[PDB]
Amino acid sequence: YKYSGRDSLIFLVDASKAMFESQSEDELTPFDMSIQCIQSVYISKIISSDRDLLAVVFYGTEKDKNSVNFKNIYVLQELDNPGAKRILELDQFKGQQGQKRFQDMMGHGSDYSLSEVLWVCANLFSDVQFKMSHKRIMLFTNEDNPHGNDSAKASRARTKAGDLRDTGIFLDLMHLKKPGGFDISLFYRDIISVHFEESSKLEDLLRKVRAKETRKRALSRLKLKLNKDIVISVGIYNLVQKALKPPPIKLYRETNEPVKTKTRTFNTSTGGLLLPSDTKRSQIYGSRQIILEKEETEELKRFDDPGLMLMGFKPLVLLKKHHYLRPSLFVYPEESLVIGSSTLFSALLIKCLEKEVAALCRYTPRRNIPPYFVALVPQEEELDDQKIQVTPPGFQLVFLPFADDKRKMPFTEKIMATPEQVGKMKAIVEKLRFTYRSDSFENPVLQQHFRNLEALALDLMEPEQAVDLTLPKVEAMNKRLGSLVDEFKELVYPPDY
Amino acid sequence: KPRGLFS
Amino acid sequence: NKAAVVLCMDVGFTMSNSIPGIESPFEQAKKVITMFVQRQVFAENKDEIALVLFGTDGTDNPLSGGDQYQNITVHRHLMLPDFDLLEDIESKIQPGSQQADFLDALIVSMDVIQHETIGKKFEKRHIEIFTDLSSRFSKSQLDIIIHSLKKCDISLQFFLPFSLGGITEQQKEGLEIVKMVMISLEGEDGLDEIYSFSESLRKLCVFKKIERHS
DNA sequence: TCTAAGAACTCTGATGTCAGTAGATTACACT
DNA sequence: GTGTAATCTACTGACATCAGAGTTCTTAGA
């Protein structure tokens, strides 16, 4: 969808005396549940998609404020990019004292009308200026029948909700909790897109995930040319990137302002200012000094017009995994440039996959760049688990290494193992299996950095101090393997360390 | 192995 | 690691003429030593260079004599390579009209090695001679030469116009002598140390692979 | 009796990229 | 001339990326 567009999620909580203080037992509280959900998702979005939009608006309240000065609807914070000054506001309400503040500021929960509430949220999404990619509304209520009393209010509700469904807005409520009254076929089967007293869909909205994402952004579109005449339009996309931490920004002590670095280059002999033309590049070889134009210091790289140069094809056994160079990229046609080329791309893909052979090419990602040798190893799609994309279909880009890379190893001799200890090591390696899923682990560094960021942002009592799967679970290895370490000690180990 | 003029 | 390089070239008369269809061994080996000197120049390798352009119409050698160590002009002693040496190779060289022995030049370069490679720390040595095998040479000190090459750890390679796989009987007997000498250095594998000149171009045109220890 | 040289990694800053947006420039055009 | 188009080219947010610079460790080491 339209990239500059953005994902927008508005929040809407049932503010009646209904669940402000249900507290049937003494372990949770539906408002304290919804506010926890909102705080959690909102902090997750902070780091995750800092560019997105959120908004929180309660309804049924006794005080009033909205765009249209309606009754019993309160826009807590408008649609705006997420920020701390808002998590603070939400936190102000988390707590028994917090709920006392909430009730004595806006209301216990007056009469309401979800028809009008949806009206309010609609106006909200309208008011924003940026383009919206996805638009989603989250109710947090439980009165599984909004009102069985004045049916006319109900007819109006269904009408407007259908409209919002037609104006491009989705709507979703997670049934939080009610004694009984845990059904959606009562008035919502026609609203949202069997049933029980608590929502699974709200469980994950506490999972508290904090990576970040970028959309389908082409890293570069270049024209794969079979020869000097046939060319096809390929989008070099990226599928693994090693997210570094967001680059820090320099600020002043007394005021926390941006500081606008102003690096420059200037003369030592005089207090002059060398303009960029007035510099030269240099090296020192053979006790003699060298000069080139700054233009030339990049002209010394012009090798080929940008694009891909397929030469031949190569038997996949030969593309050895032993010599990875940089993260691979992905190949998939872009119909925009050379119309119809997607056909030829598909043709190459199908045929190569069928005949089990690679496709080698020259890659010049941008101008001014030396070329490397990269192979277009084709990839078949896989969907089986739930018929959702897993490995996207097309060609990889395994960069093949250059001679300047082999890094000749300091030769040492081999000593084969005896089949006895390797036969036991079979058992060792069998015992410690574990299926490795792609997204198994996290950076402790990135994760902890992000954490400490929230910590300093929200004036918390403590850092979260995440515990991260990277460290091994030592007792597990000590146990599940058994004492076989002494077995291999007595098999293949003398006294010395 | 290559030596001298080649090393 | 350290190494010492002493390139030995002839500037005699025979290389001044050759088949019109192929460049003279003079200019051929000239480009070769030029391209080769470029190789150890760019690489920052600490290899030290000395040059022996034997077959000289004069004689400028530390061991000057009426007939012993004669017709030799060491371009420069065993120090680091540098550009001006390459340029002076490109310009100062002149076609000759004489003919001189190489074994003489071999001993001269040998003496330079013994006189300097102990004077400053080194680890290993080479000696390379480029010639066309058109010399009048005696096999006297060959045993002693190979002996003290073994003793001083100096590796000898020869580079000849002809290909192993039409030369004078002088050239042919020189080639057989060269085979004898190389086997007397290492053994049967000494055949590989024989080198022609076109193969030198083919194997050497590339610049020096940027090696890096881990 | 110890002092540099490379190593290595991370980090920072520019260069170039892509999609989007929208402006101003340039073509087209009036009987 | 006057006025309305069509459309190229701009800028920015944003994201990769080479290079460049700051930093710790082995050998060779007075």
Order of strands across the sheet with C194-195? C74-79, C48-54, C3-10, C124-130, C154-159, C194-195
d(CA A182, CA C102): 105
Residues 195-234 of chain A in contact with strand D via CB under 7 angstroms: 217-221
Helices (H), A303-383: 341-355
**Contact between A237 and A219 (Cβ < 8 Å):** yes
Q: Which residues pair with A424 in a beta bridge?
A: none
Whether the Cβ atoms of residue A173 and residue A192 lie closer than 8 Å to each other: yes
Report d(CA A453, CA A43) in Å as an integer. 11
Q: What separation in angstroms does the CA of A267 have from each of A262, A270, A279?
A: 16, 6, 10
- CA distance linking residue A357 with residue A289, whole number of Å: 49
The nearest CA of chain C is from the CA of B1 a distance in Å of 10
Which amino acid, A180? Answer: G
Kindly indicate whether the domain formed by A6-213 is annotated with CATH number 2.40.10.220.
no
Distance CA C139, CA C149 (A): 15
A2 assigned to active site: yes
Question: Distance from residue A463 (CA) to nucleotide D10 (C1'), in Å?
Answer: 24
Q: Is C209 on the interface with A (CB under 8 A)?
A: yes
CB burial of A411-429 (b: ≥16 within 10 Å; e: otherwise) equals eeeeeeeeeeeeeebeebe
User: Would you give the DSSP letter of residue C192?
Assistant: T
The CA–CA distances, whole Å, from A202 to A174, A180, A192, C104 equal 6, 18, 15, 94
Task: Indicate the length of chain C as a whole number.
Answer: 214
Is residue C109 within 8 Å of C127, Cβ to Cβ?
yes
Contact indicator for C25, C16 with CB cutoff of 8 Å: no
Q: Do domains A214-241+305-402 and A403-497 have the same CATH topology?
A: no
Q: Do B4 and C126 touch (CB under 8 A)?
A: yes
The CATH class given to the A403-497 domain equals: mainly alpha
A278 to A265, A294, A419: CA distances (angstroms) = 10, 10, 71
* DSSP H or E run through A43: helix A30-48
Q: Which nucleotides of D are covered by protein (CB under 7 A)?
A: 7-8, 11-14, 16-21
Q: Which amino acid is at A140?
A: F
Burial of C201 (0-12, 13-18, 19+ CB in 10 A): middle
Widest Cα–Cα separation across chain C: 53
Q: Which fold does the domain A214-241+305-402 belong to in CATH?
A: Ku70; Chain: A; Domain 2 (2.40.290)
How do strand A394-400 and strand A372-375 relate by DSSP bridges?
antiparallel
Write out the H or E segment, with its range, that includes residue A395.
strand A394-400
**Domain range list for chain A:** 6-213, 214-241+305-402, 242-304, 403-497
Q: Is C206 on the interface with A (CB under 8 A)?
A: no
SS3 labels along A397-410: EEEECCHHHCCCCC
- CA distances in angstroms from A359 to A331, A349, A356, listed in the order given: 12, 10, 10
**Euclidean distance between CA atoms A289 and A87, whole angstroms:** 60
Strands A329-331 and A378-379: unpaired
CA distance C34 to C41: 10
Q: Give chain B positions within 8 Å (CB) of C128.
A: 4-5
Interface of A with C in 250-309 (CB under 8 A): 285-288
What is the SS3 assignment for A347? helix
The C-alpha angle with vertex C183 and arms to C179 and C184, in degrees rounded to 5, equals 115
With the CA atoms of A14, A15, A18 and A24 taken in that order, what torsion angle do they form, in degrees rounded to the nearest 10? 90
Pick the residue of C49, C207, C211 with the most A CBs within 10 A to test the interface with A by mutation: C211
User: Smallest CA–CA separation between B4 and chain C, in Å?
Assistant: 5
φ/ψ of residue A362, rounded to 5: -105, 130
- Structural contact between residues A136 and A122, judged by C-beta atoms closer than 8 angstroms: no
CATH 4.10.970.10 fits domain A242-304: yes
Q: Residue C211 and residue A286: Cβ atoms within 8 Å?
A: no
Judged by CB atoms closer than 8 Å, whether chains meet at B5 and C159 is answered as yes
Q: How was this structure determined?
A: cryo-EM
DSSP state letters, A189-256 = TTT-----SS-THHHHTTS--------S--SEEEEEESSSS-EEEEEEEES---PPPPPP--B-TTT-
Resolution (A): 4.6
- Written as one letter, the residue type at C135 is S
Cβ of A248 < 7 Å from strand D?
yes
CA distance A400 to A415: 31
Nearest chain A residue (CA) to C41: A286
> What does residue A110 show for φ and ψ, rounded to 5 degrees?
-90, -170
Q: How far is CA A249 from CA A18, A100, A348, A452, A458, in A?
A: 46, 40, 47, 16, 19
User: Strand E nucleotides below 7 A of a protein CB?
Assistant: 13-18
Q: Nearest C-alpha of chain C: how many angstroms from B2?
A: 9
Q: Give, as one character, the DSSP assignment of residue A187.
A: T
Report d(CA C42, CA C83) in Å as an integer. Answer: 10
Query: Identity (one letter) of the amino acid at A287?
Result: S
Token couple for A471: 């460290």
Half-sphere exposure of A86 (CA within 13 A, CB side): 22
Beta strands A231-238 and A281-285 are unpaired
From the list A469, A450, A458, A464, the residue with the least C-alpha distance to A243 is A450
Q: What dihedral angle (degrees, nearest 10) is formed by the CA atoms of A231, A235, A240, A246? A: 130
Phi, psi (rounded to 5 degrees) for C126: -125, 160
Beta-carbon contacts of residue A74 (< 8 Å; ≥ 6 apart): A15, A57, A58, A59, A61, A63, A64, A65, A66, A106
In chain C, the DSSP E strands lie at 3-10, 48-54, 74-79, 124-130, 154-159, 194-195
A173 φ/ψ angles, rounded to the nearest 5 degrees: -120, 140
| Cβ A394 vs Cβ A380: under 8 Å | no
The residue whose two tokens read 């309400």 is A93
Rounded (10°) angle between helices A96-105 and A30-48: 90
Contact C155 B5 (CB under 8 A): no
A86: which 2 tokens? 């808002």
- Tell me, what DSSP letter sits at residue C120? S
Q: How far apart are CA C11 and CA C91, in angstroms?
A: 14
Pair type for strands A358-364 and A372-375? antiparallel
Asked whether strand D has any atom less than 7 Å from the CB of C214, the reply is yes
Pick C3-207's CATH classification: 3.40.50.1370, 3.40.50.410, 3.40.605.10, 3.40.50.720: 3.40.50.410
Nearby residues of C48 by Cβ (< 8 Å), 6 or more positions away: C3, C4, C5, C78, C79, C80, C81, C122
The per-residue DSSP string of C1-58 comes to: --EEEEEEEE--SGGG---TTS--HHHHHHHHHHHHHHHHHHS----EEEEEEES-SS
Q: Do C160 and C133 contact (CB within 8 A), yes or no?
A: yes
Phi, psi of A437 (to 5 degrees): -90, 155
Tell me whether residues C41 and A285 touch, CB distance under 8 A: yes
Q: Find the residue closest to E18 using CA and C1' atoms.
A: A369
Give yes or no for a contact between C3 and C47, defined as CB atoms under 8 angstroms apart. Answer: yes
Cα distance between residue A455 and residue C88, in whole Å:
69
Footprint of strand E on the protein (CB under 7 A): A 51, 212, 214, 217, 219, 238, 241, 243-244, 326-327, 365, 369
CA–CA distance from A385 to each of A191, A379, A404 (Å)? 30, 18, 43
What is the distance of C-alpha A220 from the center of its chain?
20
C81 min Cα distance to partner chain A (Å): 7
The two tokens of residue C138 are: 């005696």
**Would the CB atoms of A286 and C41 count as touching at under 8 Å?**
yes
Residue A155 vs residues A165, A171, A190: alpha-carbon distances, Å: 15, 17, 12
CB C194 within 8 A of CB C160: yes
